[model samples]
Target: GSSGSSGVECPTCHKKFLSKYYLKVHNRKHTGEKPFECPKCGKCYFRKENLLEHEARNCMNRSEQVFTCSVCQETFRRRMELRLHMVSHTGEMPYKCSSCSQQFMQKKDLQSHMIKLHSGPSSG
Candidate 1:
């Protein structure tokens, strides 16, 4: 077969991966070789990264992960949402319009502005 003779390919699914680690991890989908188990909960994961993500987002100790904004005394469910809310206090307009270079703090505002003002070909 001419299917990636050089790359690390899975024999069961025929999926090609860049490295042996990736192919070994992907092989767990077929072999059910979930080795990474959580310390708080007994749920298993095929990969260590998935276990870390589960610990960060949806673990038994997620109540301790509540994010509170120190600026406005606002509470957010996730750390990323609290970080997003903190941008309003910092006044950092990260999203910019390609046509007029008008900046926006939130991507929703940028998309709305682009649709209302810069959607036409005259934006050039």
Candidate 2:
């Protein structure tokens, strides 16, 4: 008879959960529980959010969607990927190296190259 507790509710089933965590887990049902899937390879996801992020980033294989880059005449499966590639032609590497003044297409690639080439001792 403890009615004071505001139990967690499922958005789809409208079922009340005893704990917030349970509700979060249950909410996956309405959210189309992806459980971590790979869009490119059709791999199942270990978590829903991971799959969602992958889809947002268009890491999956999109055979139907074809994007042609005007700068380099390169074709991409996704528009976003093509846009990212266009940065190469424009030399728009927002992420640059402070040491050698070198630029990179992707920020992650630039950082990795910098760490590997600039941070350590020179090899004879």
Candidate 3:
């Protein structure tokens, strides 16, 4: 077999994949389609594994682990999660929106906020 039983090379990166599933996921780098959706927030992810990671790290309403942000007193289940949350209070919006000049603590939050706030007309 020309594939040599290692499956196909990724179309974008030329990395060899061992299975069709991995190849399919790697193809998403070109398509930018996230078929997996988070049930908690309807957030879409490029892969099921990424969706699970999002559910674990974010999805505040779904997570059971609890830790407190030392600076802001916000509670989180995981310590690293708490640390990420504290970064929000430090006025660190590393992710900036070019359209509205707004900043966000996380890139995902910045993107979602821009689409929601800038893309629509205010009802009020």
Candidate 4:
């Protein structure tokens, strides 16, 4: 089946949508209408999907749920964040760049280094 769609453009951002339902959802971004709220954290989001993701990833309503670090007693949103923080405490650079001899504790740090230094000045 071929799904042909058009019209229903947003006035604020001038973005087009396939349906009014999606256009209404997109309007929440401009209107700041965050109906979707997390019961555990009281945090609001423009979309229900975002609120659900936040609850699952950051604000879970558990009896005793905390990604606590044993080295420095610091709390984190997720286990991966706690693991990254622990690396900084032990001075361990797990992520290394193949282009240069530089290293970093987090993978993003190495990625930025690769783009800033190794990937040349212009990449169009």
Most TM-score-accurate candidate: 2
Cα deviation at 3, candidate 3, in Å, is 52
lDDT of 4 by residue, 1-124 (tens): 4244576978875756778887887676467556876787555665676666666666635444355455444667676678768878878667777866776777887888888777759773
Return the lDDT, model 4, position 94.
79
Score candidate 1 by TM-score against the native.
Answer: 0.25
lDDT by residue (1-124, candidate 1, tens digit) is: 4345567888975768778997996676567556876677644665676666666656554353364445544567776787678778888567878889887767998998898787755765
State how far residue 45 of model 3 sits from its true place (Å).
Answer: 26
* lDDT value for model 1: 0.69
Q: Can you write out model 2's per-residue Cα lDDT over 59-119, one digit (the tens) per residue? A: 4342554654443345686766875687777766567788898866678888888788986
Ranking by lDDT: 1, 4, 3, 2
Q: What is the Cα-based TM-score of model 2?
A: 0.30
Best by lDDT: 1
List where candidate 1 sits over 4 angstroms from the true fold. 1-64, 93-124
The CA lDDT at 53 in model 3 is 70
* Model 4: lDDT of residue 44: 61
Q: All models: lDDT?
A: 0.69, 0.62, 0.64, 0.67
Candidate 4 backbone collisions, by pair: none
Q: Candidate 3 at 76: error in angstroms?
A: 3.8
Predictions: Cα RMSD each: 13.4, 14.9, 15.0, 14.5
Clashes of 3: 3
